[PDB]
Write a protein that binds this DNA or RNA. Structure first.
Lengths: 96, 83, 89, 108, 96, 82, 108, 90
DNA sequence: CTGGAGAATCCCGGTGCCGAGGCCGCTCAATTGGTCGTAGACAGCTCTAGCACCGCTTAAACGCACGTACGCGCTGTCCCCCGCGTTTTAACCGCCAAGGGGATTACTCCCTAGTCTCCAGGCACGTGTCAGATATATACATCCTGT
DNA sequence: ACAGGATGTATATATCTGACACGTGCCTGGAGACTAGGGAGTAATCCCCTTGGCGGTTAAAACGCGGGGGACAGCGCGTACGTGCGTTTAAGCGGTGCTAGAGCTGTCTACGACCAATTGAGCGGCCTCGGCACCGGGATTCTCCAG
């Protein structure tokens, strides 16, 4: 007898939990190296502030949160609960 | 770990699922993960690119947090909490 | 910064409650940002009417432009009262 | 030798510095001249709005029996006021989070 | 035999024809009186420039055009071809 | 006389023609009244802001420039009137 | 008695008036001082963009066999140039109409 | 005062046998003045963010790079750079 | 559908550490007290054009009759992403070490604002003409009834 | 779906006028040239924190094995909005007359910038303890199985 939860239970619990809390969810080093990696097109061997990467995570996660809220407004508006790529595309069009 | 890599998976799939939960998403298509990597990637390229434009104008070799803040301001997404 | 001033107001509203530094920085960013918005709108108000001076009229009208409803109304109440008080002194 | 100095804020019964804000106005490239009643009026409005946000954050802090204000309360305070949210709909507060908001059709 | 045409055909002719032209589609005097009537709440017996009212018609009709384009993007997005009030409400929500 | 109920002067056929110019192909009957309400509130906001400029401007007649600046205020700058 | 004057536009091989743009910059409340290469550079950029939009507009006027430019061709020029359209995505041109854009599913 | 006849000079460079209307010219003047104010405002923010009190052609160049997307910005830098260079030898 | 079982999270209780909060030198910026020049309020007046009013037509609004073409729910199909455990990495955490470069100050250049005069591109304002408003007739284009 | 008919709409063609195009008198704003002040570059420094290294653990990424739960199409019901047309209106067109008020011009006063000297609140650095972290254990809460 496995102790396994039904689909949506853990989902909603972590919604309430991580929306109740405010800590950062992305790993420091891989995300920072990805930032430097994308940044390679301007200067080789870049030195970046740690707090700048912190702000990058803040803007990234907050931006995704708001964008997916709008995506959710579209999906529910389009009678769905599973988001699709074209909802994100529509959101980008309305935003610009 | 010298030059570009497969770090596009750095924002990982369960991290996307966590952020989506923080955004209020209840169900996530498999196509959404790739969509998020691409759309988020493009967006970050735009904003961070503008930050780099400030920095290269700023005659510095180190990107400071202020460049990121002002970059966010440049697109009408002003940031509180870093100066 | 404006940190300790937000702390002064905090002691006027909640004398036994404290505040983190990071949140205080956020509030400092809020004050500076909204400040720049108000001054910018007042600047274009001076431009539109071919004025080269931003007076209390432009500030008041700009506040009425930027703040919705009761925040604006009471802002005029508190502001106007304050300007009257300084006009006495 | 000269007469004693008091803050123009105190003359208006205010806490926010009329001098510093006034200086940011002068050095802020907005107009050639800034009226004398403007910084007093502006400082009063910002102190008023500040009192609103701090008052709401204080209440929110009381709602978890904590005496130290963290960004989360500022987030709750800003997004729970219609007029401030209208003032701040495009702004991002670091470490603030989001108001609990799940659409009714998603709740069981 | 009537020469009554079919639903949608004349609509399409209006789309192509009036999108091919640019003139304003609202009567000057009723719109102007509406402007003065709503404007009543500030000064009674307000006097207005005619060309200002014309500019109001310009802005108004163009704003409606863009907003209904976004509405149409939502409707087609939501797999409909008949716009609903909820689409307008969603548009206003995302626009702020 | 004083003006009343001119919100109905922005007629439903005119709204149909605009929506065709807006690219709308089918229009619900509820859209017309919804449009009068939404457009009404919108115009109240923009025009109200223009009146705020005008009352500041010490004038009794609203000039076109007030409307232009009002449109700019909401980030909807208008070309072709000054 | 003084020396032969000559417009700064012609010295830069430009059409747009350096002087009034520079004056708007000085009296536009932007900075304490504005560099000397700034107006020439700005007038060159605006003149170049003006040439782009007037070029597209002129071709558009030719497409309807007319010699006088009307706002309609300006609207076509703006919304047809991706970068300029991006620059002017939320700007309203009076009497311009829109580009003919019917969604594919709406066509029969 | 308007840029009308200057836009006409540009028109004579691009289409000598083509005319114009006053209303469209007003639209173009509004375009020039608006985009102008955007460029100057962004340059103001550029000087401010690094606490520079001087807006030079460097700040304008960077500003143009911020505002104009891609190839239009590259040719803006090309034409402006060539232009300014051409002037500084006169 | 109604009722019983269990774990996560919250909560209830008890403990130690360090950053927030309060103190303490030490500036340096806000304040006061003048003065100078001017932006802008004010008064009367001009005279456009907005209001007010007259008069006839049909563009346009309103309503009706008719039909059509549109949204939406349900059931099924299928199908795919969530849940959890397990392994594995390598970020993380805790730790060690140099010096690049951010930030500074010290010098010194040189770039840009401010003025006065001059004058020429442009400003306002009239004038003629061909663009455009108007007229008339038609294949083509578009729809649609008909086969 | 295929074919022919009918009509709008642009088009072929033909005519008539006014606002755009160009000219003129005039001006006022931009260019030349010149000075004076002061923003920013360059050089070289201190030392923070970035880079770059060691070393163990488990958080976390990745993966696999169910299986629950969601997007989507067909299709039938069933509605209500579009199109056109006929009637009726007041906006539209055009025509009339006056003065409200935008705008200007001439006043003169009032207000905000500016500088210098002082200084006290605030700046930066430095402790101190109870907020907060940590831990341990049960009620509540929420989910899920069970009859």
């Amino acid at each position: 007898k496995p102790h396994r939860y039904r689909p949506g239970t853990v989902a909603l619990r972590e919604i309430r939990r991580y929306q109740k809390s405010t800590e950062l969810l992305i790993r420091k080093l891989p995300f920072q190296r990805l930032v430097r990696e994308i940044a390679q097109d301007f200067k080789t061997d870049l030195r970046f502030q740690s707090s700048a990467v912190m702000a990058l995570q803040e803007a990234s996660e907050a931006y995704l949160v708001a964008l997916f809220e709008d995506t959710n407004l579209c999906a529910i508006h389009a009678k769905r609960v599973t988001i699709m790529p074209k909802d994100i595309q529509l959101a980008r069009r309305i935003r610009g | 770990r010298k030059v570009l890599r497969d770090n596009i998976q750095g924002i990982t799939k369960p991290a996307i699922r966590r952020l989506a939960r923080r955004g209020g998403v209840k169900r996530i298509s498999g196509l959404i993960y790739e969509e998020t990597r691409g759309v988020l990637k493009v967006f970050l390229e735009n904003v961070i690119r503008d930050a780099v434009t400030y920095t290269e104008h700023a005659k510095r070799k180190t990107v400071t947090a202020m460049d990121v803040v002002y970059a966010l301001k440049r697109q009408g997404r002003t940031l509180y909490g870093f100066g | 910064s404006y940190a300790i001033y937000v702390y002064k107001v905090l002691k006027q509203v909640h004398p036994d409650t404290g505040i983190s530094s990071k949140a205080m920085s956020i509030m400092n960013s809020f004050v500076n940002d909204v400040f720049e918005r108000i001054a910018g709108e007042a600047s274009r108000l001076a431009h539109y009417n071919k004025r080269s001076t931003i007076t209390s009229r432009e500030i008041q009208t700009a506040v009425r432009l930027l703040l919705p409803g009761e925040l604006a109304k009471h802002a005029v109440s508190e502001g106007t009262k304050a300007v009257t008080k300084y006009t006495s002194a | 030798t000269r007469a004693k100095a008091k803050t123009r804020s105190s003359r208006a019964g205010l806490q926010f510095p009329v001098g510093r804000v006034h200086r940011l106005l002068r050095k802020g490239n907005y107009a050639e001249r800034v009226g004398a009643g403007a910084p007093v009026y502006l400082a009063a409005v910002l102190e008023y709005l500040t009192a609103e946000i701090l008052e709401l954050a204080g209440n929110a802090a009381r709602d978890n029996k904590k005496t130290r204000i963290i960004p989360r309360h500022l987030q709750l305070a800003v997004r729970n006021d219609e007029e401030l949210n209208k003032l701040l709909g495009r702004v991002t507060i670091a470490q603030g989070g989001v108001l609990p908001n799940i659409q009714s059709v998603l709740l069981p």
